[PDB]
């Protein structure tokens, strides 16, 4: 429109043109940082370039800044994207170029650096506009007009294009025969940084030669980042594991808390898989009552992500109508924070339990009264015998904050207790053959065992309780 190149740019510009470089790559090597000159029609660019200088696959980009950065190709990428059926309000654009492109870029650099030296001018390698940078300057607005959504670097919706050039693939192999301790684009980049110039020039043409064909499009793909649903679950079964318990391809028990919640969700979110996470866990024979235990489900590659509060509520009712073994409350869409909040709860927050306790010796109401007065009891708990195969042997210090008793009969009482995170309750009752000290048996001078255990509360405020 008014040509970006100065009289100073003529020599480099002419040499590059003469040896087969396209006008847009010529701008990059002249350090044109203005976006608009790159967006002009190829024909107008070539014709303005010619006019400037007197006043066909690019050997540098192999067509990337020729046909592949123009409207017709972007339209065909977007048509592919539209057929995939994702919901999205923005996109990030990811593009990958053949790793061998860096070799050609390096050769052009050496050529331009040499010409610059003739004119006693200085050029830095960082003065060259990167291929990918210029490529996105041109294509970003084209994607945006075609798809009707903004470009957002933090978008969970990604469109990716991979280019290949089979004809020149051996260049990657040629470079490994010079510095073997170095492909990826990045490992080629690393190698070219360390290669002696004379060694580069021995192996690779300078200027790079114009090839027979442009790059092939290897892949055009799109994907949506995971979305999360969180809530709390109650568990009413004493015969249900939290996650699938599979021994040899054989199920040890049927179903799980995880599956009873999640096996409704993949059809809803049109997602390919899920990862279930929770703030802690209870054993198969343990119920979780009261407000329940926080959980989150990560839904992978969801094709549907827009849901109102009412539609999520309806989802929760669907889960709840499907089982008596579990119930879900507080179901809500959340972000990746979920994982952090639940981990903190697991590691830091108190829990509350009710245990039905048996005693060998006949007890009276008055025999368990003293437990009600014990506050912040310090216990020394060796890794339980039943979990020595999973975790290493260690002595943890744990605190029983309070205990409240309800006498039942001469050989039973109920114990309500609040404990520090990570406390093994069953071992605190029966003592684990003295591997948990203090325990209910030692404190009472009986042998005690736990008949039933219920989690009464998991004292983790996250996810917010719903009205
Ligand atoms: Cl990228
Ligand atoms: Cl827990
Ligand atoms: Cl059921
Ligand atoms: Cl336990
Ligand atoms: Zn080019």
XYZ file of C-alpha atoms and ligand atoms in Angstrom:
472
model
C 0.000 0.000 0.000
C 2.994 2.034 0.864
C 5.838 -0.467 0.715
C 7.332 -1.556 4.120
C 10.862 -1.985 2.767
C 13.434 0.809 2.673
C 16.219 1.470 0.161
C 18.499 -0.202 2.757
C 16.465 -3.432 2.429
C 16.995 -3.676 -1.374
C 20.169 -5.802 -1.428
C 18.937 -8.516 0.956
C 15.467 -8.368 -0.630
C 16.851 -8.800 -4.162
C 19.221 -11.627 -3.249
C 16.478 -13.547 -1.411
C 13.978 -13.039 -4.237
C 16.523 -14.117 -6.850
C 17.238 -17.345 -5.022
C 13.560 -18.311 -4.579
C 12.305 -16.802 -1.293
C 8.663 -15.552 -1.142
C 7.795 -11.861 -0.415
C 6.440 -12.577 3.086
C 9.621 -14.442 4.109
C 11.558 -11.500 2.640
C 9.638 -9.195 5.051
C 10.593 -11.529 7.967
C 14.270 -11.333 7.006
C 13.997 -7.534 6.725
C 12.500 -7.548 10.228
C 9.099 -6.143 9.262
C 7.176 -6.142 12.557
C 4.100 -4.433 11.158
C 1.303 -7.018 10.710
C -0.638 -5.378 7.874
C 1.915 -5.690 5.024
C 1.785 -9.501 5.454
C -2.000 -9.595 4.966
C -1.997 -8.219 1.431
C -2.808 -10.525 -1.499
C 0.189 -12.578 -2.672
C -0.111 -11.124 -6.190
C -0.132 -7.509 -4.946
C 2.851 -8.347 -2.690
C 4.925 -9.876 -5.472
C 4.037 -7.015 -7.840
C 4.774 -4.305 -5.248
C 8.012 -6.093 -4.384
C 9.108 -6.093 -8.064
C 8.207 -2.394 -8.417
C 10.146 -1.541 -5.241
C 13.283 -3.437 -6.339
C 13.469 -1.802 -9.767
C 13.016 1.631 -8.164
C 7.290 -21.216 -7.363
C 7.585 -22.812 -3.899
C 9.371 -20.674 -1.278
C 12.825 -22.104 -0.517
C 12.474 -20.967 3.069
C 8.879 -21.696 4.185
C 7.887 -24.336 1.596
C 4.489 -22.691 1.003
C 3.554 -21.932 4.631
C 3.498 -18.164 3.922
C 2.167 -18.717 0.425
C -1.076 -20.729 -0.040
C -1.289 -21.936 3.598
C -1.682 -18.530 5.220
C -4.467 -17.440 2.880
C -8.269 -17.310 3.209
C -9.139 -20.356 1.057
C -7.021 -22.759 3.146
C -8.181 -21.271 6.466
C -11.773 -21.699 5.238
C -11.101 -25.410 4.635
C -9.574 -25.778 8.132
C -12.639 -24.074 9.624
C -15.072 -26.303 7.677
C -13.274 -29.316 9.184
C -13.549 -27.703 12.629
C -17.249 -26.979 12.176
C -17.962 -30.648 11.249
C -16.479 -31.854 14.569
C -19.457 -30.584 16.578
C -17.716 -28.896 19.519
C -19.222 -26.071 21.548
C -16.813 -23.142 21.985
C -16.774 -19.369 22.493
C -13.145 -18.793 21.431
C -10.143 -20.726 20.164
C -6.388 -21.104 20.485
C -4.588 -21.976 17.269
C -1.726 -24.460 17.439
C 0.464 -25.026 14.372
C 3.429 -27.357 13.791
C 5.921 -27.015 10.941
C 8.286 -29.669 9.555
C 11.369 -29.911 11.836
C 13.525 -29.566 8.712
C 12.232 -25.983 8.168
C 14.704 -24.715 10.785
C 17.595 -25.935 8.618
C 16.378 -23.805 5.665
C 15.747 -20.839 7.956
C 19.317 -21.225 9.238
C 20.744 -21.323 5.689
C 18.784 -18.182 4.737
C 20.020 -16.494 7.913
C 23.662 -17.273 7.027
C 23.059 -15.912 3.519
C 21.409 -12.696 4.799
C 24.118 -12.312 7.504
C 26.813 -12.630 4.784
C 25.107 -10.047 2.524
C 24.645 -7.688 5.493
C 28.423 -7.946 6.088
C 29.110 -6.812 2.498
C 27.241 -3.553 3.262
C 29.005 -3.337 6.680
C 25.598 -3.627 8.384
C 24.855 -5.704 11.485
C 22.034 -8.227 11.704
C 21.031 -10.273 14.744
C 19.405 -13.700 14.525
C 16.625 -12.359 16.825
C 15.948 -9.570 14.267
C 14.296 -12.128 11.942
C 10.523 -12.385 12.388
C 9.753 -16.015 13.275
C 7.806 -18.006 10.709
C 5.171 -19.056 13.246
C 4.780 -15.481 14.538
C 4.063 -14.009 11.046
C 1.933 -17.033 10.206
C -0.376 -16.339 13.184
C -0.488 -12.591 12.488
C -1.994 -13.437 9.083
C -4.201 -16.381 9.986
C -5.553 -15.371 13.433
C -8.030 -12.783 12.004
C -9.030 -15.227 9.240
C -9.956 -17.927 11.792
C -11.774 -15.306 13.791
C -13.879 -14.075 10.869
C -14.613 -17.641 9.645
C -15.561 -19.172 13.022
C -17.099 -16.015 14.484
C -15.184 -16.316 17.737
C -12.175 -14.429 19.166
C -8.666 -15.860 19.374
C -7.846 -16.400 23.059
C -4.482 -17.820 24.147
C -6.170 -19.269 27.247
C -9.064 -20.863 25.323
C -9.931 -24.457 26.194
C -10.792 -24.998 22.549
C -7.759 -25.754 20.395
C -7.540 -26.043 16.592
C -4.282 -27.626 15.470
C -2.652 -27.952 12.071
C 0.404 -30.131 11.422
C 2.450 -29.623 8.247
C 4.864 -32.143 6.735
C 7.329 -32.221 3.844
C 8.366 -35.856 3.160
C 10.755 -34.791 0.349
C 13.107 -33.069 2.866
C 12.778 -35.344 5.949
C 16.366 -36.689 5.699
C 17.692 -33.242 6.778
C 16.808 -34.214 10.378
C 18.935 -37.360 9.910
C 21.755 -35.348 8.265
C 21.977 -33.131 11.375
C 22.262 -36.082 13.798
C 25.377 -37.140 11.853
C 27.134 -33.941 13.011
C 26.116 -33.658 16.691
C 24.645 -37.040 17.851
C 24.088 -35.903 21.460
C 21.200 -33.694 20.300
C 13.657 -34.813 15.609
C 11.495 -32.344 17.387
C 11.571 -28.818 15.970
C 13.214 -27.892 19.278
C 16.010 -30.510 19.125
C 16.831 -29.399 15.567
C 16.871 -25.809 16.886
C 19.261 -26.888 19.653
C 21.553 -28.676 17.181
C 21.716 -25.700 14.793
C 22.726 -23.469 17.703
C 25.829 -25.585 18.407
C 26.883 -26.580 14.867
C 30.070 -25.062 13.445
C 29.182 -22.851 10.463
C 31.637 -24.641 8.114
C 30.121 -27.988 9.170
C 26.603 -26.638 8.431
C 27.731 -25.330 5.033
C 29.409 -28.641 4.160
C 26.117 -30.533 4.659
C 23.389 -28.074 3.696
C 22.842 -25.807 0.644
C 23.220 -22.076 1.095
C 20.926 -20.559 -0.135
C 18.377 -23.365 0.439
C 17.116 -24.747 -2.846
C 13.491 -24.378 -3.990
C 11.694 -27.738 -3.693
C 9.285 -29.377 -6.159
C 6.245 -29.179 -3.891
C 4.734 -27.277 -0.969
C 4.215 -28.808 2.465
C 1.569 -31.481 2.927
C -1.093 -30.913 5.572
C -0.561 -33.930 7.836
C -3.350 -33.292 10.355
C -6.130 -30.825 11.023
C -7.536 -31.527 14.446
C -9.558 -29.938 17.203
C -10.134 -30.741 20.857
C -11.741 -29.163 23.915
C -9.922 -29.012 27.271
C -11.467 -30.991 30.139
C -14.416 -29.650 32.059
C -15.164 -30.575 35.678
C -18.310 -31.335 37.632
C -18.022 -31.379 41.421
C -20.331 -32.203 44.303
C -20.517 -34.286 47.483
C -21.492 -37.902 47.643
C -23.275 -39.928 50.296
C -22.704 -43.663 50.419
C -25.260 -45.963 52.007
C -23.898 -49.356 50.949
C -21.412 -51.363 53.050
C -20.607 -53.525 50.015
C -19.449 -50.895 47.499
C -15.871 -49.730 46.775
C -15.113 -46.059 46.020
C -13.453 -46.952 42.700
C -13.596 -50.144 40.544
C -12.141 -53.107 42.426
C -10.845 -55.388 39.670
C -8.451 -58.242 40.520
C -7.573 -60.144 37.293
C -9.962 -58.665 34.777
C -12.350 -60.059 37.377
C -14.490 -57.705 39.469
C -13.976 -58.297 43.194
C -17.153 -56.290 43.868
C -19.804 -54.922 41.501
C -19.696 -51.236 40.483
C -18.297 -48.385 42.614
C -19.117 -44.937 43.970
C -17.165 -43.596 40.968
C -19.188 -45.496 38.362
C -22.594 -44.850 39.992
C -21.916 -41.122 39.769
C -20.034 -40.938 36.470
C -21.728 -43.444 34.137
C -24.457 -40.883 33.390
C -22.067 -38.058 32.543
C -20.258 -39.104 29.339
C -23.412 -39.143 27.258
C -24.373 -35.736 28.682
C -21.068 -33.948 28.083
C -20.374 -35.953 24.893
C -16.970 -36.761 26.399
C -14.644 -39.598 25.559
C -13.576 -40.483 29.138
C -13.581 -39.230 32.739
C -11.227 -39.140 35.724
C -12.861 -39.343 39.145
C -11.144 -37.652 42.093
C -12.218 -37.061 45.718
C -11.098 -35.503 48.983
C -10.143 -38.749 50.726
C -11.784 -42.166 50.534
C -13.527 -44.679 52.771
C -13.315 -48.503 52.891
C -15.903 -50.687 51.158
C -17.805 -51.383 54.420
C -17.921 -47.706 55.495
C -20.896 -45.417 54.827
C -20.556 -41.694 54.293
C -23.415 -39.756 55.802
C -24.291 -36.117 56.623
C -23.220 -33.668 53.885
C -21.061 -36.368 52.236
C -17.576 -36.318 50.710
C -16.349 -33.816 48.081
C -15.612 -35.278 44.650
C -14.799 -34.048 41.143
C -15.106 -35.651 37.705
C -12.900 -34.474 34.919
C -14.571 -34.974 31.532
C -12.106 -35.393 28.702
C -12.601 -33.831 25.273
C -16.243 -32.775 25.928
C -18.256 -31.905 22.796
C -20.933 -30.268 24.968
C -19.943 -27.783 27.706
C -22.776 -25.241 27.996
C -25.172 -26.173 30.828
C -27.410 -23.966 32.964
C -27.722 -24.458 36.751
C -31.115 -26.069 36.149
C -29.678 -28.590 33.669
C -26.963 -29.553 36.186
C -29.624 -29.904 38.932
C -31.507 -32.245 36.577
C -28.329 -34.234 36.093
C -28.006 -34.651 39.844
C -31.616 -35.866 40.058
C -30.873 -38.402 37.291
C -27.909 -39.772 39.269
C -29.988 -39.839 42.464
C -32.954 -41.582 40.818
C -30.607 -44.312 39.542
C -29.244 -45.698 42.821
C -29.960 -46.202 46.519
C -26.297 -47.061 47.176
C -25.112 -43.488 46.716
C -26.582 -39.998 46.509
C -25.023 -36.788 45.172
C -25.588 -33.208 46.329
C -24.106 -29.802 45.448
C -23.486 -30.835 41.820
C -21.977 -27.911 39.938
C -19.637 -27.072 37.075
C -16.212 -26.018 38.368
C -12.708 -25.335 37.049
C -9.400 -27.157 37.478
C -9.045 -25.601 40.969
C -11.109 -28.628 42.046
C -8.040 -30.870 42.302
C -6.199 -28.459 44.622
C -9.145 -27.870 46.954
C -9.764 -31.584 47.415
C -6.099 -32.407 47.987
C -5.916 -29.731 50.710
C -9.025 -31.179 52.388
C -7.521 -34.684 52.314
C -4.227 -33.531 53.866
C -5.437 -30.900 56.338
C -9.101 -31.056 57.302
C -10.765 -32.945 60.144
C -13.244 -35.757 59.713
C -15.997 -37.007 61.929
C -17.091 -40.627 62.476
C -19.557 -42.862 64.260
C -18.463 -46.344 65.306
C -20.471 -49.249 66.764
C -18.052 -50.835 69.212
C -18.089 -54.311 70.781
C -16.367 -55.169 74.067
C -15.409 -58.655 75.277
C -16.132 -57.758 78.904
C -19.565 -56.681 80.155
C -19.649 -52.897 80.424
C -22.068 -50.433 82.013
C -22.935 -46.889 80.887
C -20.649 -45.583 83.622
C -17.628 -47.503 82.167
C -17.492 -45.410 78.958
C -18.263 -42.032 80.571
C -14.585 -41.010 80.861
C -14.194 -41.000 77.069
C -16.465 -37.922 76.936
C -13.909 -35.902 78.928
C -10.840 -36.726 76.814
C -9.948 -33.826 74.503
C -7.194 -33.653 71.865
C -5.894 -37.140 72.671
C -2.501 -37.819 71.102
C -2.173 -41.271 69.553
C 0.872 -43.043 68.086
C -0.320 -44.995 65.055
C 1.971 -47.374 63.162
C 0.930 -48.030 59.557
C -2.021 -50.446 59.887
C -1.301 -54.136 59.208
C -4.037 -54.137 56.543
C -2.232 -51.456 54.485
C 1.437 -52.433 54.982
C 1.529 -53.786 51.406
C 0.566 -50.387 49.924
C 2.377 -47.831 52.118
C 5.781 -47.818 53.913
C 6.113 -48.565 57.641
C 5.934 -45.343 59.679
C 4.662 -44.019 63.013
C 2.255 -41.100 62.585
C 1.175 -38.825 65.416
C -2.578 -38.268 65.228
C -5.114 -36.394 67.382
C -8.587 -37.486 68.464
C -10.182 -34.090 69.084
C -13.209 -35.303 71.007
C -15.294 -38.385 71.638
C -18.971 -38.727 72.553
C -20.426 -42.012 73.749
C -23.847 -43.601 73.568
C -24.201 -46.768 75.639
C -26.119 -49.583 73.916
C -25.852 -52.774 75.992
C -23.459 -54.839 78.103
C -21.201 -55.544 75.104
C -21.878 -52.558 72.784
C -21.590 -48.796 72.649
C -21.520 -46.135 69.986
C -18.634 -43.732 69.714
C -18.838 -40.409 67.886
C -15.424 -38.882 67.214
C -13.669 -36.049 65.442
C -10.124 -36.746 64.249
C -7.167 -35.199 62.466
C -6.890 -35.937 58.732
C -5.429 -39.377 57.965
C -6.369 -41.064 61.273
C -7.200 -44.769 60.986
C -10.340 -45.221 63.050
C -10.648 -49.026 63.041
C -7.108 -49.361 64.423
C -7.809 -46.761 67.116
C -10.734 -48.866 68.376
C -9.179 -52.360 68.356
C -5.543 -51.267 68.773
C -4.078 -53.270 65.851
C -2.285 -55.607 68.325
C -0.848 -52.580 70.169
C 0.403 -50.909 67.003
C -1.967 -48.019 67.663
C -1.317 -46.574 71.110
C -3.657 -45.272 73.009
C -6.651 -47.170 71.682
C -10.180 -47.783 72.963
C -9.260 -51.243 74.311
C -6.258 -50.024 76.313
C -8.116 -46.949 77.627
C -11.024 -49.134 78.770
C -9.052 -52.243 79.828
C -11.133 -54.454 77.498
C -10.618 -56.007 74.101
C -12.630 -53.796 71.756
C -13.581 -54.307 68.123
C -15.377 -52.124 65.627
C -18.530 -53.633 64.116
C -19.708 -50.696 61.951
C -18.042 -47.441 60.882
C -19.701 -44.363 59.301
C -18.111 -41.142 58.116
C -20.376 -38.441 59.606
C -18.635 -35.442 58.067
C -15.679 -34.493 55.886
C -14.829 -31.001 57.087
C -13.918 -29.568 53.685
C -15.839 -26.448 52.665
C -15.259 -26.993 48.977
C -17.356 -27.184 46.604
C -19.798 -24.496 47.877
C -23.009 -25.942 49.342
C -26.066 -25.335 47.155
C -29.537 -24.041 48.140
Cl 1.703 -23.261 18.175
Cl -10.387 -39.064 54.290
Cl -29.605 -49.543 44.445
Cl -10.124 -46.744 59.504
Zn 8.335 -18.112 2.280
